Nucleic acid binder design. Sequence first.
RNA 1: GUGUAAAAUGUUGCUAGCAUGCUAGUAACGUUUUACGCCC
Length: 951
Amino acid sequence: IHGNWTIENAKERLNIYKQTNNIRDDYKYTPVGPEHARSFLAELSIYVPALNRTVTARESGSNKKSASKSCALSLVRQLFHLNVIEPFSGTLKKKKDEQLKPYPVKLSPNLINKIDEVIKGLDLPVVNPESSVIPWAPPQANWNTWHACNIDEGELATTSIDDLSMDYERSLRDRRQNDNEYRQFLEFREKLPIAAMRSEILTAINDNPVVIIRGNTGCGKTTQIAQYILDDYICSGQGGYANIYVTQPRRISAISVAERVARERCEQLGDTVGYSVRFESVFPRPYGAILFCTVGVLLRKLEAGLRGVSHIIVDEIHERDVNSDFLLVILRDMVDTYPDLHVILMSATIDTTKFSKYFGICPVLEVPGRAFPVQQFFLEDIIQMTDFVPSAESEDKDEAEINYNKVCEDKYSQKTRNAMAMLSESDVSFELLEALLMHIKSKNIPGAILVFLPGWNLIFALMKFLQNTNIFGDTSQYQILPCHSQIPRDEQRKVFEPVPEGVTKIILSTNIAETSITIDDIVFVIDICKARMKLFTSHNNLTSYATVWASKTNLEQRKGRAGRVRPGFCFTLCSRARFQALEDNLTPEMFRTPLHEMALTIKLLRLGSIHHFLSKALEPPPVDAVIEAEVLLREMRCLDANDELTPLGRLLARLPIEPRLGKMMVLGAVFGCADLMAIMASYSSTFSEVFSLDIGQRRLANHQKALSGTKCSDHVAMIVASQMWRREKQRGEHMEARFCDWKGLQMSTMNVIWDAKQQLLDLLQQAGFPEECMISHEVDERIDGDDPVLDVSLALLCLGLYPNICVHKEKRKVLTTESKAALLHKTSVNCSNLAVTFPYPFFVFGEKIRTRAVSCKQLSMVSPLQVILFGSRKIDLAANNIVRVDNWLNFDIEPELAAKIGALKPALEDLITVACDNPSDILRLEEPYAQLVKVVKDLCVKSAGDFGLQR
RNA sequence: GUGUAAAAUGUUGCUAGCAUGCUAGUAACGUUUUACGCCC
Ligand SMILES: Nc1ncnc2c1ncn2[C@@H]1O[C@H](COP(=O)(O)OP(=O)(O)O)[C@@H](O)[C@H]1O
Ligand code: ALF
């Protein structure tokens, strides 16, 4: 009854018990009765090695299988009677894991005495359980616009701006006279649509303060309007008294548009057109030049001043990203206060009425967009055409989910015939491409093939699948090219390269190709209205790089993205039900996003209360976002609760990194490890791959794993790689490139990290911290012992990236907070196939890749002594003398020792505050603070928490 | 994006026997669940 003592249940425990006994016997069958009333008596003997009480089953049935089942019934009943078998044994039985045992403290008495002296030498008692605007000026002599300062030397110090304007004018006249490649580029730009209303757009801008351009995508407009403004300003011989400032919302888009405008101008990058993306600047000449930058770089430059720039040409606003709307909200008042500035907002296809209404009903210009509506087809249309039904043959939820695929009427074509024949919907197959090919060959429509896959992972998977199906994946006849941010610029520049007809172009891309760039020859668009949704859930610190449906506005744009003049075809892979069911627009990301970084930015520019500023924005954000920004600023001691920016906050604002790494960079110079902190912050915030993985590789190679050395950490590997790269860069790069390739170095990532380290140390120098601590602290990896610099660097790392720590159980299988299973990313140095146990069973990662908290990246072993030092914002005490870390980690330490360790929590903040207050003398601290530095260097040593008992 | 053993279904052919059928299994088949152990 209670143990469901029947045949097809409760037998799992019996099977396991017999497996433990290894008895391979079964039921012997004996016939009883005639052939018309046949019965079988089955026998089985079971030996019990634990109770020494052998049992037997002798039961009858209508057949051999029935006899065996009847015997097993009585066997389970007798095993229960024996009180040795486990009851129930249903289909519900899992196997999980938890903490086994740490090395809780077990320190030497020296460190205990040091900690006691520190807690008594610093008196840290613990209990044992207004709206102004940024000034702007017109162009001025001896003043550089880019650097926002006075050059006071060179040529402008003695040369008037009018002379520079005349020089630019004569140079452009000579270029008009002779530059033939410029002639062909300008004729291409003239046949380009915007050159229709050249003068018109050159005048409307002077007419009004706020100017909105509106014209369908693919006009080649961003790369032309700024150049036309410069040309108009220089044709009057005034190019010196004019500069152009443009902001894109994506880094790679900014790089691409800068390269395009340089190539069309037939000029080397950095002469008259330059770009300043985060951690990279190629600033051009100070006068008569164009600047492209991301919104973040402009928000950074806003601190100094917009002096010396003529017109600002803010790019795509339909993105609705937080940065662009913040910039627009500031720029509204900026251009209202100063009537001599010209703000330009650019869109692609959006009801710009709200944008115009925001700026006091500003003019909404228009571009004549030649177009031809394209044939739009859906899943019913494609099932009518060439079959569409089959496919490749918190946990859950409620009934609120509606499957529109299964809610429809079968008034369409032979749905059952298509189902019984074939199809492949979720994964594309020969069907779609062959249908397009036959449509082209029968209706005579040679044209490019365009698809919008949501993510780079799916892009790579489908590219590999189509390469496997190379009969129709034949690049010689069916050219295939991806397009995404991650891939190098070589693929982007190859995409634009045309191919002869017959070599069909099948472009695989994502939301990037919907704007920014546009291929002229696109005819047929195969949309799936799927896009990446890399959302960070800061309310619980879970990442989700999932895929979500595109908005109806975006879907309409994609429908219009193809078919310039040719008919064009839209092969939408969705039903009309979902087509009309999804939201018309896209949810404003500004509504749901933490605003701590923007709060620090607004407090840096002394723009008054954040609440009032957010009220006077495009969309009044919900009070939760401003409240959470306030909470983060108050708890992190960047901004006081009384809207008073402490020097810590002002220092953090200038840092081009998130505050969670600025808090580490502050302490980096405190403990004489600033180089390590700069390198780690650059390698962490700038999400990048450490090593150049070769094709067909599933793990890290021999040297790729040996570079981490005895430390066996990817962060230590990166540090030593940077050290060897810089000592090699001390020599020539001709052999350095092949050496880095041999060492599996990413080269470009290393350059980025080095430049970021240089910029961070320059910023720290400007802050006031001494140069002496900013010296090389070279760490070797072959040493398996201890090194104070490296262990304090790792302790600071664990301080910063909280709560991205994890507990290792076995192989890839690791545990994360709230007891979540996870694996180790392939790029990590801790990837292998054999079972290895690490010296310390605690790891901290950088990123949580893949939505279902599975992939962890940037793993590095951490000392078991973090506990309360650098492991959390909260520590607790559990039963049976257990210290609780992040409510998912257990240590076994005396409450007195736990309180002693936890008393350091206010001390860290006090040290940070003192370091920020007096940057000039961080090396020469107060004597209790020198003792604190000494004790923290002593405590975080790798082989420290093992005294008394190594176990 | 996987294999092993166990159990319910029906199936392929065969087997010992009974007044064309029948009483039982056999080797194999796929389905569904169970755990065992991989790789992302
Ligand atoms: N790398 C390039 N080489 C040549 N022409 C380009 C390049 N990139 C863009 N163009 C042209 O410039 C135009 C750019 O349009 P775009 O910047 O997307 O305008 P908007 O952003 O207003 O839609 C396109 O029509 C395209 O033909
Ligand atoms: F210039 Al755009 F989207 F129109 F980047």
